[PDB]
Amino acid sequence: EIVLTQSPGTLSLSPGETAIISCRTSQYGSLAWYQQRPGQAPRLVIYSGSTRAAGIPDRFSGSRWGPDYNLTISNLESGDFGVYYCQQYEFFGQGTKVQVD
């Protein structure tokens, strides 16, 4: 029954605005979020809940609500667009794509 559900399916956004992504969880454990542009390996964004990976701007941040978790992206640049994956221990989320308008 250990499943991670990301929503919504896709984000249609104009560059420069603010957006939020969610990842509900059904088991106790750490979380992390991954950035994948097409044609490259994914990259670590945040881990251990809300802490941050090195070398990434501060615009990426996340919040823990217990069995629910959210990633907030403010002032969305042109390069940030891609596909975002949620991850506990093994178990990955469905993956969602943020796309330009």
């Binding site: 029954e1 250990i2 088991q27 454990g29 221990y89 093994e90 178990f91």
Partner: protein, 461 residues
């Protein structure tokens, strides 16, 4: 409020966290035998009759076995102690010769576990050689490539690293070895029998030295360990994390009784001026092959007891065991040393079948090796010389090492498999009770004194 002034007190009893090198002390007069031992120093002499203990009332201290500072300290001691005994012993460089090997025949029969190999070895004088032979009781010798001939072989040391013989003088023994902290430091101990490996312990006591920890080395099963007090205990960093290792403690052991029944004969080969090489020369008895026996009744009870205990953490999931997934020969088979021979036992039935835990003679074929890469994985190469005559072993299994398969298994099932390969997890199952804390008689405390007016003396208050 009240009038108060500073006061100094300090031969005070308070401690702080720290880590330091620890002296070793061996039980009884074993220090007199320890001079001729490895896995034992030269020697761990005690000065006082250790161990001694005092219970500290109303003391609660935070413990943790996975961030323990002693386990790393022992592992570097045993590794450094191990290769110091191999430092003066003969090296086996001149044996890497094109061995011509054929089937090893014995009295009215043939043995399938070994090859009869012959080679040109340097005699006393370096400009002549002789045609020696020996039975390397292992078909684990690489056939030599770049030739269609199937009868040329080679010793597996020289592909990666030349090896050193284990001298007959030193004996491999798990002698109990206590650890004593130096002056100014104190070793705590958690008496709480229900301790799961981390968190507060509210029955702390201090000791001069640790109990008789013995440095046994094995994989997939912990032998001659210290049993749990009340019941079976399972210890892991985080059971939900399918990585890490699940160390189990049995509160009553099972007896592994086994042997090397073949009657082998040691042979001395003269590879150099003083350097001598010992190899199995011939078999002077009937052949029966190594094997190990475990009680089917008692072991099957162990999995039933262990299964329900795991099911407490994994509710409503039937616990399944299964064969080892893979790895080297050191971790895919139960490996151990006994009497100078290094066994590698198949675990023919120490894996099999569902064991729900709700209650709704096992024979293990064992291989043997002479060349061993030490258990850390990339360590020193060692050649264990043969031991003449049959061998017999009797040991108490006291704990199981396990690991879990995840993640998308059927929600009502969970598969557990053996593990091993790291020395520290064997010894971390025994050093889980201890801490090392430096005693720090502290900074100031108030008292009702007034100032020391003109340096006047005082006794009372």
């Amino acid at each position: 409020a009240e009038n108060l002034w500073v006061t100094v007190y300090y031969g005070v009893p308070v401690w702080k966290e720290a880590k330091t090198t620890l002296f070793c002390a061996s039980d009884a007069r074993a220090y007199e035998k320890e001079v001729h031992n490895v896995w034992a120093t030269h020697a761990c002499v005690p000065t006082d009759p250790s161990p001694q203990e005092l219970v500290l009332g109303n003391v609660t201290e935070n413990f943790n076995m996975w961030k323990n500072d002693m386990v790393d300290q022992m592992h570097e001691d045993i590794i450094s102690l191990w290769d110091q005994s191999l430092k003066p012993c003969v090296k086996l460089t001149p044996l890497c010769v094109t061995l011509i090997c054929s089937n090893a025949t014995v009295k009215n029969g043939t043995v399938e576990e070994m090859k009869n190999c012959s080679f040109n070895t340097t005699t006393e004088i370096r400009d002549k050689e002789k045609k020696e032979y020996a039975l390397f009781y292992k078909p684990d010798i690489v056939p030599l490539s770049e030739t269609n001939n199937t009868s040329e072989y080679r010793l597996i040391n020289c592909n990666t690293s030349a090896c050193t013989q284990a001298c007959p003088k030193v004996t491999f023994e798990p002698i109990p070895i206590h650890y004593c902290a130096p002056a100014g430091y104190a070793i705590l101990k958690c008496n709480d029998e229900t301790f799961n490996g981390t968190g507060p312990c509210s029955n702390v006591s201090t000791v001069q030295c640790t109990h008789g920890i013995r440095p046994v080395v094995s994989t997939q099963l912990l032998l001659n360990g210290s049993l749990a007090e009340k019941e079976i205990v399972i210890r892991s960093e985080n059971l939900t994390n399918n990585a890490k290792i699940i160390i189990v403690h049995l509160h009553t052991p099972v007896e592994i009784v086994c042997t090397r029944p073949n009657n082998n004969t040691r042979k001395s080969v003269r590879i150099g001026p003083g350097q001598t090489f010992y190899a199995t020369g011939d078999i002077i008895g009937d052949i029966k092959q190594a094997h190990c026996n475990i009680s089917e009744e008692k072991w099957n009870d162990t999995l039933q007891k262990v299964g329900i205990e795991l099911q407490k953490h994994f509710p409503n999931k039937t616990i399944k065991y299964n064969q080892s997934a893979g790895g080297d020969m050191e971790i895919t088979t139960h490996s151990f040393n006994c009497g100078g021979e290094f066994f590698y036992c198949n675990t023919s039935n120490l894996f099999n079948g569902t064991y729900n835990g709700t209650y709704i003679t096992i024979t293990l074929q064992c291989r043997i090796k002479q060349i061993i890469n030490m258990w850390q994985g990339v360590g020193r190469c060692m050649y264990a010389p043969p031991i003449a005559g049959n061998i017999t072993c009797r040991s108490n299994i006291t704990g199981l090492l396990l690991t879990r398969d995840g993640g998308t298994n059927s929600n009502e099932t969970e598969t557990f498999r053996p593990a091993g390969g790291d020395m520290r997890d064997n010894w971390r199952s025994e050093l889980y009770k201890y801490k090392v804390v430096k005693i720090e008689p502290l900074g100031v405390a108030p008292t009702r004194c007034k100032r020391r007016v003109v340096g006047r003396r005082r006794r009372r208050r």
